[PDB]
Amino acid sequence: EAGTAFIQTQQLHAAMADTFLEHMCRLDIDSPPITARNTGIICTIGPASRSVETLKEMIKSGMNVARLNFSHGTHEYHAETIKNVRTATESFASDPILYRPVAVALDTKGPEIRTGLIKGAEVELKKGATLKITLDNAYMEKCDENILWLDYKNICKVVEVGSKIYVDDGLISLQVKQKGADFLVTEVENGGSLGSKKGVNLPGAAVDLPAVSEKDIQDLKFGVEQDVDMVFASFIRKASDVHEVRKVLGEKGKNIKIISKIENHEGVRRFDEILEASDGIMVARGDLGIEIPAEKVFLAQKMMIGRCNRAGKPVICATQMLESMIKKPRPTRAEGSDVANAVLDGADCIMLSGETAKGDYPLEAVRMQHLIAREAEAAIYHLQLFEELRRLAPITSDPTEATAVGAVEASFKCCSGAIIVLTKSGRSAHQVARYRPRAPIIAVTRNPQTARQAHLYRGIFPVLCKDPVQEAWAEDVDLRVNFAMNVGKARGFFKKGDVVIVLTGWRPGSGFTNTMRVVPVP
Amino acid sequence: SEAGTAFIQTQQLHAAMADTFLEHMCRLDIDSPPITARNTGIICTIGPASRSVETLKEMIKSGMNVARLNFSHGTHEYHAETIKNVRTATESFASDPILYRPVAVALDTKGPEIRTGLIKTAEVELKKGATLKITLDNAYMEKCDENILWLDYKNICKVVEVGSKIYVDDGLISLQVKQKGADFLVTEVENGGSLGSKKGVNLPGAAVDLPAVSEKDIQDLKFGVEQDVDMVFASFIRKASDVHEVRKVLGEKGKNIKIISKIENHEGVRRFDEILEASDGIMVARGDLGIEIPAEKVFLAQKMMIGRCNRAGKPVICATQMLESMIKKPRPTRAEGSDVANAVLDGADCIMLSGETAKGDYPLEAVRMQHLIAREAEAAIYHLQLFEELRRLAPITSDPTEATAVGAVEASFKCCSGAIIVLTKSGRSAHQVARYRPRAPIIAVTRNPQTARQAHLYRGIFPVLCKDPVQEAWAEDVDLRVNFAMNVGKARGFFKKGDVVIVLTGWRPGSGFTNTMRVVPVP
Amino acid sequence: EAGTAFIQTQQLHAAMADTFLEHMCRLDIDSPPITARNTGIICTIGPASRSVETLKEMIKSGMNVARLNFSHGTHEYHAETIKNVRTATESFASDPILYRPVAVALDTKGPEIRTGLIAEVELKKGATLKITLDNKCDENILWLDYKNICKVVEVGSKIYVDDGLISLQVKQKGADFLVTEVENGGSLGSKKGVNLPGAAVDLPAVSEKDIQDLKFGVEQDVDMVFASFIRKASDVHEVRKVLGEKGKNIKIISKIENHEGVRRFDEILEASDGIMVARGDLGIEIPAEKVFLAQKMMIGRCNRAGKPVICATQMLESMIKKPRPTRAEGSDVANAVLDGADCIMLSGETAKGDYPLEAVRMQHLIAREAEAAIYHLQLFEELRRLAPITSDPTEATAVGAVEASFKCCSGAIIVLTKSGRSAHQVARYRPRAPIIAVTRNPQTARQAHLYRGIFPVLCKDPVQEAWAEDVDLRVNFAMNVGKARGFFKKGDVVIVLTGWRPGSGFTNTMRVVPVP
């Protein structure tokens, strides 16, 4: 096999139900899944998971993307994580059929509001009471109940009367009564224990902090040097923030995908322009949950995933996934359901955080994610997804687009085992993925970066062809198609006598993946 | 460059197809030019008014796709020279392959007939209410008059009852049978009129037992094979065994000749399904049906038969009483414009003109007018619904050609393509596309001359005959054929630089299936 | 049973086909029709048909509306026709189950350009012909009574003569004479009709004579007016003005007879109560390759608006001399029905031909056969999707009635209506089941015939003191009419529309009711 996630046996000839309701009634928990796991698994690599050995096991169990969290660590430390990721990835390269591309993602620390120290270190903040938030440094090393300092100079500009301010990522709540001439005076809504350099969130305030801190500028230039596939850009509030990130990555980093993290109210409010400007979106439920009423976050998640699905842009669901698996070898029922529901809402990828970065069971976390994501696939109602996305786009006439919608249509009609797409940039495979076929998309490419970036898209299984370009265009095609047939047979996607859809250009160095073939598997 | 006037059919590809049939009707505009090409085939009967090489050339230029020969009259030698003139006219355009329009030759048999005897030519006046005795007794063959009538159908009596109608001379004279003898009938003249010598008889509702193929038809079918006709229109088909008989006589030499069954009576309508299964296509002969069946049911029979043909993906031709007024006038009635148009809208693949082109005074104007009406009727077809219904009825399979043909039609609607280009040897791939009824014209590129001619049986196929030799690189042989079809479509005004067309081909030489679809911008 | 059109037996639990194509595929010429005849029949009354005896037989054979052509005849002559129509109609009053309302239609003469008098001269094609106003008939000289042709004709105009049989081409005017050349040839008799292309005709839409005819119609209590030569909204407004206050309930049906009417159709429709498509007149200016489009477009727009549309002219012409129609005529009629026409009108066939009775019965036969080919599922689905999104209770109620009628395979939708409004709303959505509109207003009953699928019945019973008893009595009358006509039987289901509580007028109440 070469890993517990390698073989994902499909059955192609099930009756598709005429209604969503019937699709639900037919679910059967005693039935093994009969579909591939189509959602991407992103794991945060840190102290628990950064050894070459653990990483190999994680790749086997279904990790597609390694996330590096630049909130902590030096460049040296993260360069050594990346090197171990690439060693573990390349250890499977000897067998091109069993090689799984693994992407590297750099997640920036991003703009932050921090308190100043207690004196340096705890203080008890009293339900009711008053607290003055002060702003000049002559009060930074001394806090306690009376006063509190923080580094965001413009708080007073962006806060109004009755605004919430949260301290220590949600713990302490505050209610601003008056803006007191470059000061703030606050009623303690919640109250708890207060420490030093604790994070501050401003629900519904249009924070004025730069798109990119100087620390992020240096971390993004390191990402370019280190050849990363994508960046997760923090606290994105407007289209300009994205353009700034893109400016920093410049010409050398132009092929690096920018995933915008939506972590506050302004980001949700300005989502359309953020989406316009971005390559993808990450929904940070934890951070949204501080910034926005608890009970609206599920609305915000569903909206963002629907809009991304409509634009054909990758969306990653993040934070609070299998967080209990930091300390235990199984997740709760509720975690299972939350993960499942993100896949069912239409997420392309699910990201694991502390569960893989620093906890006691990184391996089991990956495996459990793969199990849940794969079981969720039974409850996806493919017909409706495809029918609605088809119905919700213009004429276009872009040959590659027209051919993508056709391949997906053909995949349903023929109950195909796969859609094989030959692609240099990945674009055709991405265009196929936005129409949400049931069949796996086998994206055959010679470009190693294309192959790694393809993991951002639901349903793309990237395979990296290492064979040189054959002279005769038609036999170069048959060779890449052959490689795909062999992977798909080996992963149990299909077998002899099944049918697959094949997408290609026509003749060498053509503009457009504009050629669709329906091909029996030999 | 226009050597036609049916040749240039300028299409406008970029308007939204309405979301309802009702809205499509509401948006019809008599003041704007048609934006579609003329997709139904035109079949013209060639006779004294049309058989010269010169008239035939202009008939091709005006839209004629198929030359019909009516073997009801004329000798083998008369019909052989007609066929020769059709081919001389057709081949006069071969010098420019872009202007060349394939033209098919169809042979329409006389078929089985019931005929009366002689009036000792002389006529006698039959009067309503009077009694007429019909006798089989041949001692009377030559002495028909106002009291006794001899017919040559020796089984009439087996097949008729008291109450039964008998029509004579194309429905002019009606008799109801009042007493049923063994060798004879006695009947009340219901209608009345002047009865001539050797006139045709119809038995409405009677399961007529004459042979599928007369002695004269066997001779005519063998001549068809020798003359390399493209199709036969077989008369008075009543049941599956009738079609098998025709197929047996055409035999192995005639195996590629298409058999179109003419439905001309009640039994044919009733046994339509078995006839359709056995036939290559169907011709609805409304005039004949009008005698054989209550006049006011014929429109139901037509709609029914055209529907079943569309469902089966088999050509259906509507014939008789099309632009008949144009035998003597240079313009048709409003009613005829409407009846032709409604046969197009019913789903007809082709329309056939008869005396209008065979013997009338304005053969050329009948062709021109048929083309005008058919092209305007196109605006009124709601293409989207036909396709969606045919897609949803089709038996579900994973067969690659069919998935590809359906996909190609789907893409043609979604990209508003200017054409579907299909490279086809036998024509099958192009026929598979046509049966899904795209709005866009199908340009079927073939090197097979016969394939090119027979393609006209299907609505929407514009066949072009590629003359170039087979290139050594398959990919180059494809682009050569595709380029040719591009040149043709540009010249006919189907599309232009910037537009998109759908292209269907195989994948490598021979292989098996036309399983490749490309969405190609027009260079 | 009194008459050949009375019993229209139905079978209800069909299963409608999933596609239009399957619907066509399942047509079967040997099966008797299993639906009522839903299309209205309008007959022109004239010398052959104006006797009480003939009118009675015509009613029994399916005539729903009697058209009076005021192109000819005096007020005295028409008053007597109307009196005969009403005598014949009221002869059936004595059994209310058997009583069929019959409407009277007044068709205006309108403006008419007409030639003079000399035998037939053959205008051989190409050969001169000058027109004169000087109050003589060969290839040079022809006179006509439109004093302003010269003012309205500019070198290159066309002049049609005798119902488009001839077409002359002016290309030199002389402000009193015109010098034409024959463009289309034919034989030319005496005292003919003439037309000009586009909007050239400036003659008033309502003439002094039309004003007198329309006021006559008001005093004779006619149900509808067929307004000739309507070319724009303001022609409709002038007719409505003349009919005025007293004639406010008279339906105005604008006749579309020329290219200009087609061009300005949207405003004519808006301003009219309905439309008549005069195919023959259309075919004078408009070529044969376009007339069928105009017909389909106009019937389509009428259907979308919910306004009655009548197909007229060249229907069963051959039946003027023959007792049977041709195949082509049968098809032409059937195709008007399938196009969505609410009524079909007979002209010379009933007015002056030898077989008035047979032309009616044969119209009925064809219209009833055409019903099998109508795909009611799609009509309703589409008209539902294209209706403006209102909350109007009467509209929601009508749509719900039709939907319940399909779901329940109901034998009928029974509508209790003083004004007919609710029955008209239901007919717009094209149910398969017949609409039995129960009314005590005789005008409502008569005007109902303009709408496809309405069977109007006139309740003669007095109002019951208890409202629910008054409702049950009218519904019971409807059940009886429907059983006698064979629409349904005991054990079937019907849809019933009413108001809630006495003397409303607002029909917002739907019930699903077993046939007892």
From Swiss-Prot, chain A:
The gene is PKM. Changing residue 424 to R: Abolished acetylation by EP300. Abolished deacetylation by SIRT6. (Microbial infection) Binding to certain oncoproteins such as HPV-16 E7 oncoprotein promotes homodimerization. Pfam families: PK, PK_C. The modification Phosphoserine is found at residues 31, 91, 94. The keyword ATP-binding applies. This is Pyruvate kinase PKM. There is a cross-link at residues 109, 257, 261 (Glycyl lysine isopeptide (Lys-Gly) (interchain with G-Cter in SUMO2)). The modification Phosphothreonine is found at residues 35, 186. Beta-D-fructose 1,6-bisphosphate binds at residues 423-428, 473, 480, 507-512. GO terms for biological process: canonical glycolysis; cellular response to insulin stimulus; glycolytic process; positive regulation of cytoplasmic translation; positive regulation of sprouting angiogenesis; positive regulation of transcription by RNA polymerase II; programmed cell death. ATP binds at residues 69-72, 114, 198. There is a cross-link at residue 157 (Glycyl lysine isopeptide (Lys-Gly) (interchain with G-Cter in SUMO1)). Residues 298-522 are annotated as: Interaction with POU5F1. InterPro entries: Pyr_Knase, Pyrv/PenolPyrv_kinase-like_dom, Pyrv_kinase-like_dom_sf, Pyrv_Knase-like_insert_dom_sf, Pyrv_Knase_AS, Pyrv_Knase_brl, Pyrv_Knase_C, Pyrv_Knase_C_sf. One of its GO terms (cellular component) is extracellular vesicle. The lineage of its organism: Eukaryota, Metazoa, Chordata, Craniata, Vertebrata. Keywords: Acetylation, Allosteric enzyme, ATP-binding, Cytoplasm, Glycolysis, Hydroxylation, Isopeptide bond, Kinase, Magnesium, Metal-binding, Methylation, Nucleotide-binding, Nucleus, Phosphoprotein, Potassium, Pyruvate, S-nitrosylation, Transferase, Translation regulation, Ubl conjugation. Substrate binds at residues 67, 261, 286-287, 319. Coiled coil: none annotated.
